[PDB]
């Protein structure tokens, strides 16, 4: 009876196994655009993905994750609110059963159809496992998805999902360029928060882009054909794998733009 997104093990239950669920810097949060302060010290976000090396895509039982070779400085995030260099390790999404919900962060209470997380770890901690034990261990770049025109750069991801339908399935996924998932503007909000799946560690500097990317209805529909369950088990569609907004508590969200 482990954590999940069902009726008996979903986000409202997680605190029982992971008490930090009720912590002081939990994510996601609602971004109140009128309360976020423009910060004239925030540098432009530097995203250097030209040498990114994807390896594999995995159905991990709550989402799918595209993993990268992070053994060299190849795909790095720096600048913005960050000190130092953070290396890309994986990206994954959160999505809904319907276009009207699916994002984890919300903007003035608005829910998007999905949310992309590009997860990076602080190179000063040597690897991901050590980084998540530190308050500044991770930087996660969050990008909202809305349903409209197709995102061509996403299609290679959508087309491989049939091969990883059920929990535990993985597939070779090389030469995928995550630059094809970025919106035009890198304007962002930033605040200190946490992983949004257990163990919910409070190790993340969140950088959430203001500009959503558009994906097609057909693209998001294919996300919804994935399964939470393993092969040979009763079918449960992988939908609504998003944690709802958590109390902001003692935190200020800063904006890179006015
Ligand atoms: Zn996530």
From Swiss-Prot:
Every Alpha-carbonic anhydrase domain range: 1-257
Catalysed reactions listed for this entry: hydrogencarbonate + H(+) = CO2 + H2O; urea = cyanamide + H2O
Phenotype upon changing residue 92 to Y: In OPTB3; partial loss of activity
Phenotype when changing residue 196 to D/E: Strongly reduced activity, but enhanced zinc affinity
Site (Involved in the binding of some activators, including histamine and L-histidine): 90
Domain of life: Eukaryota
InterPro entries from the UniProt entry: CA_dom (IPR001148), CA_dom_sf (IPR036398), Carbonic_anhydrase_a-class (IPR023561), Carbonic_anhydrase_a-class_CS (IPR018338)
Compartmental location: Cytoplasm; Cell membrane
Annotated phenotype, changing residue 62 to G: Impaired activity, not rescued by 4-methylimidazole (4-MI)
Cofactor note: Zinc. Can also use cobalt(II) with lower efficiency, but not copper(II), nickel(II) and manganese(II).
Positions bound to Zn(2+): 92, 94, 117
UniProt-reported outcome of changing residue 197 to H: Higher affinity for bicarbonate. Enhanced proton transfer capacity
Assembly description: Interacts with SLC4A4. Interaction with SLC4A7 regulates SLC4A7 transporter activity. Interacts with SLC26A6 isoform 4 (via C-terminus cytoplasmic domain).
Name this polypeptide is given: Carbonic anhydrase 2
Organism: Homo sapiens
Gene: CA2
